[PDB]
Structure 1
Amino acid sequence: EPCVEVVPNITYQCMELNFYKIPDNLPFSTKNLDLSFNPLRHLGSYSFFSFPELQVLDLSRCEIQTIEDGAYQSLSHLSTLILTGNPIQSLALGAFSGLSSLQKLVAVETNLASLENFPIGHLKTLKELNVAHNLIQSFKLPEYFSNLTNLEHLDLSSNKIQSIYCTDLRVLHQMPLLNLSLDLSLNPMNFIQPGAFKEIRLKELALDTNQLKSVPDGIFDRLTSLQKIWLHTNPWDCSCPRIDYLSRWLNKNSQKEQGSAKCSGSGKPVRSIICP
């Protein structure tokens, strides 16, 4: 057997074994399958018919360019799907058909340019979507996000987002159950429009290591139950009264600040600024 048997009947590690096809020699009972670093290249319909009990499937760095309709149709119990580092160029509209239990979808560095085209609108069980390290230019969340009533973590870090506009979070405003962690850090973001966050419950908000010189007055005033926020490594303009709102807010909410937002040119912590 080429794969490593971690737990008999349950967990198999098939990493870097030059598989060009899904293995057919493993137990039907398998729950956890790691196929990372294999030249899989294309996933046809019913690729995982031998693995109906799968809960976790790792397809990281498998050179996958295309995923056909029903590629994972068999996988009614899959909770975690990992597609990190595949040069995906064709994702069929029914690519994720059958994934009735999916809670975590990891699509880091999958050549993703927009959420609009991304066929995940039927995955109502989804709790976490990780699309970090991609090519997304817009934070406008598509209408299908209203289907994702269990979403609690959205990672859009290391993308190509330059702005947050008011309309961007429109879909989320109608969703009271929401308790969302939102990572928008490591983006070339230099603009946040006034009123962009209106009373959403963002448990966590990361906007560090962007290109922000300022934020609108009152931008965070309507946030509900914010627990942690990252704002550091931005070129903050600490001239008064421009920095008045943000310095006041960070001072008051200092327990929530992770890391230290600092003034461009002086390095003084933004939370320590007091305008005359």
Structure 2
Amino acid sequence: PESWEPCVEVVPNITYQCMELNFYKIPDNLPFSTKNLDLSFNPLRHLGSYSFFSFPELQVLDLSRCEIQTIEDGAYQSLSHLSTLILTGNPIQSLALGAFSGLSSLQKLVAVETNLASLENFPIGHLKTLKELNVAHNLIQSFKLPEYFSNLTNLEHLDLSSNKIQSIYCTDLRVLHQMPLLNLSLDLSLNPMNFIQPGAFKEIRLHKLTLRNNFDSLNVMKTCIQGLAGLEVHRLVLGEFRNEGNLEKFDKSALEGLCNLTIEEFRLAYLDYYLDGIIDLFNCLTNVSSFSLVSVTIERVKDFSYNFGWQHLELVNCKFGQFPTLKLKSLKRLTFTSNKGGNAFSEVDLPSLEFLDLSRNGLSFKGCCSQSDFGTISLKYLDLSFNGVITMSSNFLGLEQLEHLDFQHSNLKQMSEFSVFLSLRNLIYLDISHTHTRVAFNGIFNGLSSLEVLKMAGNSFQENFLPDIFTELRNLTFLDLSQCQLEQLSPTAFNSLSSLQVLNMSHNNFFSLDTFPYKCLNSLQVLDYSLNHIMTSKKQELQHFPSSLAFLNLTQNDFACTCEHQSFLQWIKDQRQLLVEVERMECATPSDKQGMPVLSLNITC
């Protein structure tokens, strides 16, 4: 029981959590070297001068939900190293002018739900180091940025979401026009926004504007978007919240005002309204370099065949009637993930495409894969995991540049009917784990000479036997054969794999541990043999492990702990320094010893 208790020591000398411990005062029982202090949920109520004198080293200070009602001049005066101060959910009634003097290093100030009514009198003007101000969930009615904002030269994030702003006027942003270093992100979500004045954002430059769930109606939305005219935004995020008041209609005119801003990246994040189709909807965003829809519903996806100039398209957690037909000349990166509905993949035409993420859609793929499915010869990265049945009919013709291929948990078919990976001379990473591949062809991995990582857990092999299907895979460093119902190894399966570092043989059906097949694995560091049925091993077969082996996992096997197997049990003691979680290595038999840790075994042999 230590001097810092009841607080929890997260990182000795450094980080202490004194959350919810009925502390009525800043504790005095902590190291002077403490950098991170969590004092959230304590009835501190009041913060007088030099309240944190005991913590000259503090960098992160959390005072969330501490019932703090008044903070006096100099309260933090000694904390010239503090970068993060968190004040969330304190009903602040009185906040002295010098409340935050001494905070010479403050980068992040979280004042969420601290009863803030106005930024004008909010005593932070002197914190020139401030990178982020979060004042969400307060009572601010005015987007008039006070003049001291001219001082906040490093401000990169300002969060004003969940306040009471109804209107934004041109003269509200007077201060911003004077201002140099602009990497400014602004969240204005969940303000009951009824009007933004045309001109208000003329010649304003923002990194990011988030405006979700601001608008009572479509017309109010249209009105307010017009007031953004001339805004220059790297990233614009529109949309609304599912658990929140939502727009009742949403037609082609809804985003017509976007034609008057300069937007590099666009996201629409959640829309309640079911879109019949997108004809004309996104006309102002045809040349945005990044276009993203999340959680929107679109019945007719026929209209995605339009040649937008997007370089990055992201469609996530959407519901589409059909798989979109995509013909995008400039698209480099496609993320189409976690979508529902129509879900048979159909050919896309994407000549610039290098990055393809098609995962987690439950997609069917009638005949995979080649340039003609995608329209590109430049693909480096293909993620087709967590989908439906993918029938292999082409061995990646035209996709010779692929470096990363993931089919994980997709039901692959026809995997043994030809060398389905033959074209892939540059593939570095392949995951065909849990694809229900039943290996019945020794040429299954022909072509994969650059392969470094091969995950194929949870498949199976003809005769539960591992044949020599790897001899061409010289550059392999990671191989996962766990859950493959393996019973026998070809003594030669692994001979060429002299770069292999991690071999996973977990959860297969081995009854003994034969080290011979592993003798040529000069780089082998990690060998996982857990969750097999290993009961014994002959002395001779235990001797061939490369000495590079650092982690052997033999946990959860069926060790027989009689004198008949003394050599194996002895060998296990001898290799203790290689063995992982020896606690979890238990005698399965005899019943005398069942449950007894193999290393602490009491036997006389």
Partners of 1:64 and 1:133 in 2: CA distance: 16
Contact 1:246-1:270 within 8 A present in 2 as well: no
- Which protein is richer in strand relative to its size? 2
- Structure with the greater relative contact order (CA < 8 A, sep ≥ 6): 1 or 2? 1
**Structure 1 alignment gaps of length 5 or more:** none
Corresponding residue for 2:223? 215
> Displacement of 1:198 after TM fit?
1.5
Matches within 5 A, 1:49-60: 49-60=53-64
Corresponding residue for 1:117? 121
- Aligned-residue CA RMSD (Å): 2.7
Corresponding residue for 1:188? 192
**2:234 is paired with a residue of what secondary structure?**
coil
Aligned residues: 272
Matches within 5 A, 1:1-276: 1-211=5-215, 212-215=220-223, 219-232=227-240, 235=247, 243=254, 245-246=256-257, 248=259, 255-259=265-269, 272=281
Alignment-mate amino acid for residue 215 of structure 1: T
Return the TM-score normalized by structure 2: 0.42
Bigger mean CA offset, 68-77 vs 175-184 = 175-184
> Displacement of 1:106 after TM fit?
0.1
Partners of 2:283 and 2:154 in 1: CA distance: 41
Could you give the per-residue CA deviations for residues 60-84 of structure 1, whole angstroms, max 9, x where no partner exists?
A: 0000000000000000000000000
Contact 1:213-1:236 within 8 A present in 2 as well: no
Could you give the per-residue CA deviations for residues 165-196 of structure 1, whole angstroms, max 9, x where no partner exists?
A: 11111101111321210000101101111011
Contact 2:71-2:99 within 8 A present in 1 as well: yes
> Displacement of 1:237 after TM fit?
7.3
> Displacement of 1:230 after TM fit?
1.8
**1:258 is paired with a residue of what secondary structure?**
strand
Contact 1:214-1:236 within 8 A present in 2 as well: no
Partners of 1:45 and 1:124 in 2: CA distance: 22
Alignment-mate amino acid for residue 119 of structure 2: L
> Displacement of 1:159 after TM fit?
0.5
Q: 1:123 to 1:5 in 2, by over 3 A?
A: same
**1:213 is paired with a residue of what secondary structure?**
helix
**2:113 is paired with a residue of what secondary structure?**
coil
Partners of 2:248 and 2:256 in 1: CA distance: 12
Return the TM-score normalized by structure 1: 0.89
Contact 2:183-2:207 within 8 A present in 1 as well: yes
Alignment-mate amino acid for residue 74 of structure 2: G
Alignment-mate amino acid for residue 258 of structure 1: L
> Displacement of 1:7 after TM fit?
1.1
Partners of 2:164 and 2:278 in 1: CA distance: 27
Could you give the per-residue CA deviations for residues 81-120 of structure 1, whole angstroms, max 9, x where no partner exists?
A: 0000000010000000000000000000000000011000
Partners of 1:66 and 1:197 in 2: CA distance: 36
- Percent sequence identity is 77
Corresponding residue for 2:455? none
Partners of 1:118 and 1:217 in 2: CA distance: 29
> Displacement of 1:260 after TM fit?
5.8
Partners of 1:27 and 1:53 in 2: CA distance: 10
Alignment-mate amino acid for residue 33 of structure 1: L
> Displacement of 1:224 after TM fit?
2.9
Could you give the per-residue CA deviations for residues 24-76 of structure 1, whole angstroms, max 9, x where no partner exists?
A: 01000000000000000000000000000000000000000000000000000
Partners of 1:142 and 1:27 in 2: CA distance: 39
Partners of 1:269 and 1:215 in 2: CA distance: 21
Contact 1:248-1:271 within 8 A present in 2 as well: no
Contact 1:121-1:145 within 8 A present in 2 as well: yes
Partners of 2:190 and 2:43 in 1: CA distance: 30
Bigger mean CA offset, 107-116 vs 165-174 = 165-174
Partners of 1:133 and 1:253 in 2: CA distance: 27
Q: 1:193 to 1:65 in 2, by over 3 A?
A: same
Alignment-mate amino acid for residue 230 of structure 1: L
Contact 2:232-2:263 within 8 A present in 1 as well: no
**Structure 2 alignment gaps of length 5 or more:** 285-605
Alignment-mate amino acid for residue 88 of structure 1: I
Contact 1:77-1:100 within 8 A present in 2 as well: yes
